[PDB]
Ligand binder design. Structure first.
Ligand SMILES: [Zn+2]
Lengths: 199, 69, 94, 103, 137, 34, 52, 142
RNA sequence: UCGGCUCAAGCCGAUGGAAGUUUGAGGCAAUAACAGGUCUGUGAUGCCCUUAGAUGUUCUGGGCCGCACGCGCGCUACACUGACAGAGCCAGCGAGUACUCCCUUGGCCGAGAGGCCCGGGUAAUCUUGUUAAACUCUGUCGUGCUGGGGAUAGAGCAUUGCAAUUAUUGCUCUUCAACGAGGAAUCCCUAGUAAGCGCAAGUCAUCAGCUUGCGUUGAUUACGUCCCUGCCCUUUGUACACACC
């Protein structure tokens, strides 16, 4: 009886974060594989990895830690991912209870849709824009998506009686399809539109 | 900019009308959709729980979440 | 302040006040005493005299009233003249 | 010839000089077939002082940190009374020594 | 239906939809915790709002306020002494604070004390630097 | 003195608030004899 | 007549000074040195103090 | 199997023991209650009316788990930070008389004894056995 | 050690390994200059000046803090990723008493600040496991400048000190200002780093919003370029060489 009696069913099953097995992940598109890593799972994102030491060592990392790190910002939330890991796991339950689908399915398909493909870079034109509408790499896609996603949740929940958990929850489910009521997708769509102009 | 601290008849029968049809219930949703105070929401939460119409998922000092029975 | 002992300077000035009060003739105001010290609490026993307290440059004399028992004598002679001010100089331009 | 279980302590600024003194002292004693409990070495204490370099204050502000270190390395022994005077001879310079009978 | 969302004690309205202990804090001269002490000793349900109450409990509430020392409250917890050379204690309330505030000014004014001069002119009385501090307003 | 200062109603905080308030041809250092 | 420097001087600053300057500013009190911080680094090697 | 105090949830033990101790109903109250600030750093009295009894469990438990304890050490264990306003915060310890007299009363009811040997107070055999019983009950109820 | 570039010096990437950016961080540091700073560190020092109504030394009181207003380094906040009430509970660097009064445990009195009586330690032995803060669990409050915020002031109680008024600081009760993420501008920073949070030492009888050090939690983005702002090397021009002052 060294281990808690209640949490015993998992042992006869493949490794998972109790409530959700990572098995049977989406089949929707390509070009973001090799850059989202789930093939080696983890229970909790609180792993003290040395991803920063090299260029692409942070490319081999479960997406679950990425979300937790991105959520903590703005001075007060510096190094306190415990709340962050709390919210993400709890928010998973909300969307699972609000929709029969797997919450990892909710997070993955949203982030693969909310990334731009072309953008614009400010080369010197003596005060004007020679903006050639350059392309974007798949790695930067997820980097900007996660960053802008988490910012959308906090700004919405700010100065409101709603809390971030369900606010973040609503953000993911609206981004599943073209709801247009999501911070991410609204700003995402304009980016190509201004880029398409200077094409 | 005030939420009625006391529950009236009009809110009561609306409550027992729809709360068996919601998918999720929270403190926020009650204060938002039903124009009720947060204090009464926690009071309503505990009373409707014991009568057995919503099921608890997790309990904690900050957020309580319940679904259908 | 009174629980601790009182040194030569308090006793010295009190005997000056005592001498003035005894030699004063009724229907007249007692003579004036000038001092530099400014750290004596006001005592009801010390009523009926006129004291010229030093204000850092000059001696200022004030008649003592009874209801001020809970202050010092220094608190009754200002050190600095109030600032009327003037016209801004060649500064404050950057 | 009643033993008293003495203890002898040493102090110095150097490290290598003191340390070789400690080994030779233990072997000089041991040659006459006396029992000895080994070299209990006390911890080294480090003390620092930081001060400003400039004497006036213009320019950037820069500090420097001087240091000094101290060692103890005391020794104990079980022996009769006056053999200590013959044995504690031939010490170095600067090195201080204090003897505690610990009776 | 006894929900009366307005109350009137000592010439000032107070709200009723808030909690009982915090409503008394609205009155000048009493704080959030001083209210707690006296509202605890009157044996009133602290868990309910200030609107669902009635007159009789209110009577004991206000009664404590005027004479504190008679109802087993210490002296150091109070906020008034030495109104004169031979003085007594007190517990000043909404309009007595302004009245006793004024009084102090002409007392110090007529005595011609340094503090009065600062109050007269209107500068900082307690010693603090002013040459760059809060001079705009 | 101190008593007189109280009577000396000349200029106060409100009075102070009420009261209201070249080309050189030389180069960077050439100016003056500095 | 000998009351000119009567006032006690065993309390606070001014009752102590550097062994070489009698300069009462920035004086060191750690470890019982009582020497100016300025004069220090000129006799530091003699006292025995080496930087690292 | 056999259990002891160290085999139960912390916050459960204090709540479980608080309920039992009040049902027995034998300990002095010096009247300090209703007028205490809980410490020089805190602002309002605790909310729960029965806070004073609850506290009893917490202090009894640690004296079992420590070699020796005294009145002064509880001050600095129970303290916390104080919002001095716009200046930065520090660490300040709790009230001394409150902790002193409460454990005076506690030891009069045969739970611990004085230690003039070295200082402080250690728990006594009967007191040690008492805590185990309440802890044991929790295990099966779980 | 390997696998692809490559004449080579090397660079990158995988494996092994505690460690593969010079393994991480510092100390010292060339030829030669500046009318850079310091005469207020020195019984280091030239000249000038003052010297007994002293610019020598000493005692009393004050001021350097006085305020319509412009500028710089910092501290607290604008809240729910929060405030408030209980409880669970984890460090490191350092410091400490002789002619003086240091670090202080324990017992007793005291709402609180404080007070009295034995005692330990000149120290890996006693203070000290420095039970620090942040943090974690259970509740109250609930979008309202409200229980977020703590400027301004009144009353009272103590401590340091010869002396607290222009409040030293602390404690007790009341009073409840501006401030909803801040224009034109502009700073610091590449991994146990920024940032958050506290602790020790320095000055010190008391006073830290300051500096020098210590630990806890712990990330987004890059492995680059000369577009802006600095600097050095080459080519070039000179009627300058005290050298564009
Ligand atoms: Zn010197």
């Amino acid at each position: 009886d060294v281990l808690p009696k209640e949490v015993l069913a998992e042992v006869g099953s493949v490794k998972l974060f109790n409530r959700w097995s990572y098995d049977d992940i989406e089949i929707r598109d390509i070009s973001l594989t090799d850059y989202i890593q789930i093939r080696a799972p983890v229970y909790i994102p609180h792993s003290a990895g040395r991803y920063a030491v090299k260029r692409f060592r942070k490319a081999n990392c479960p997406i679950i830690e990425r979300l937790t790190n991105s959520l903590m910002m703005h001075g007060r939330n510096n190094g306190k991912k415990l709340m962050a890991v709390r919210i993400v796991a709890h928010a998973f339950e909300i969307i699972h209870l609000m929709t029969d689908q797997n919450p990892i399915q909710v997070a993955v398909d949203a982030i693969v849709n909310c990334g731009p493909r072309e953008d614009s870079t400010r080369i010197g034109s003596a005060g004007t824009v020679r903006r050639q509408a350059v392309d974007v790499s798949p790695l930067r896609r997820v980097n900007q998506a996660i960053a802008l996603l988490t910012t959308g949740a906090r700004e919405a929940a700010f100065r409101n009686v709603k809390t971030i958990a369900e606010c973040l929850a609503e953000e993911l489910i609206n981004a599943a399809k073209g709801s247009s009521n999501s911070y991410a997708i609204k700003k995402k769509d304009e980016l190509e539109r201004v880029a398409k102009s200077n094409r | 900019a005030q939420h009625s601290v006391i529950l009236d008849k009009a809110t009561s029968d609306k409550l027992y009308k729809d709360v068996q049809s919601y998918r999720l219930v929270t403190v926020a949703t009650l204060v938002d959709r039903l124009k009720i105070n947060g204090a009464l929401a926690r009071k309503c939460l505990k009373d409707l729980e014991e009568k057995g119409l919503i099921r608890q998922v997790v309990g904690h000092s900050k957020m309580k979440i319940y679904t259908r029975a | 302040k009174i629980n601790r002992g009182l040194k030569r300077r308090p006793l010295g000035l009190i005997k000056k006040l005592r001498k003035a009060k005894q030699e004063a003739k009724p229907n007249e105001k007692p003579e004036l005493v000038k001092t530099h010290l400014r750290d004596m609490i006001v005592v009801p026993e010390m009523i009926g005299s006129v004291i010229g307290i030093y204000s850092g440059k000059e001696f200022n004399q004030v008649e003592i009233k009874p209801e001020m028992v809970g202050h010092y004598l220094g608190e009754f002679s200002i050190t600095y003249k109030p600032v009327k001010h003037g016209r801004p100089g060649i500064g404050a331009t950057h | 010839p009643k033993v008293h279980k003495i203890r002898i302590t040493l102090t110095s600024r150097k490290v290598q000089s003191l340390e070789k003194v400690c080994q030779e002292l233990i072997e000089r004693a041991k040659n006459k077939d006396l029992r000895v409990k080994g070299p209990v070495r006390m911890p080294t204490k480090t003390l620092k002082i930081t001060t400003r370099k400039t004497p006036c204050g213009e320019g950037s502000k820069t500090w420097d940190a001087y240091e000094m270190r101290i060692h103890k390395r005391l020794i104990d022994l079980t022996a009769p009374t006056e053999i200590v005077k013959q044995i504690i001879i031939n010490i170095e310079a600067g090195v201080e020594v204090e003897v505690t009978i610990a009776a | 239906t006894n929900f009366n969302h307005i109350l009137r004690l000592l010439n000032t309205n107070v709200d009723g939809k808030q909690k009982v202990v915090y409503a008394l804090t609205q009155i000048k001269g009493v704080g959030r915790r001083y209210s707690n002490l006296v509202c605890k000793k009157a044996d009133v349900d602290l868990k309910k709002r200030a609107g669902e109450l009635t007159s009789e409990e209110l009577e004991r509430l206000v009664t404590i306020i005027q004479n504190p020392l008679a109802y087993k409250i210490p002296t150091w917890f109070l906020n008034r002494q030495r109104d004169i050379v031979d003085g007594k204690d007190s517990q000043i309330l909404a309009n007595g604070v302004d009245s006793k505030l004024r009084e102090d000014l002409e007392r110090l004014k007529k005595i011609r004390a340094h503090r009065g001069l600062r109050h007269y002119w209107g500068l900082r009385v307690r010693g603090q630097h002013t040459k760059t501090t809060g001079r705009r307003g | 003195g101190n008593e007189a200062a109280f009577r000396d109603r000349n200029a106060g905080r409100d009075a102070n608030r009420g009261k209201p308030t070249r080309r050189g041809g030389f180069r960077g250092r050439g100016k003056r004899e500095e | 007549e000998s009351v000119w420097n009567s006032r006690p001087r065993t309390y606070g600053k001014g009752s102590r000074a550097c062994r070489v300057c009698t300069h009462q500013a920035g004086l060191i009190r750690k470890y019982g040195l009582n020497i100016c911080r300025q004069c220090f680094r000129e006799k530091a090697a003699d006292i025995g103090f080496v930087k690292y | 199997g056999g259990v002891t105090v160290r085999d139960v949830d912390a916050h459960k033990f204090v709540a479980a023991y608080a309920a039992f101790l009040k049902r027995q109903g034998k300990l002095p109250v010096p009247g300090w209650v209703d007028t205490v600030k809980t410490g020089n750093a805190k602002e309002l009295p605790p909310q729960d009316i029965d806070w004073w009894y609850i506290r009893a469990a917490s202090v009894a438990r640690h004296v079992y788990l420590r070699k020796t304890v005294g009145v002064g050490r509880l001050r600095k264990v129970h303290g916390s930070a104080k919002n001095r306003g716009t200046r930065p915060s520090h660490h300040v310890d709790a009230s001394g008389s409150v902790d002193r007299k409460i454990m005076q009363a506690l030891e009069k009811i045969q739970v611990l004894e004085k230690d003039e040997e070295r200082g402080g107070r250690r728990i006594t055999q009967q007191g040690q056995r008492d805590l185990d019983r309440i802890a044991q009950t929790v295990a099966e109820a779980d």
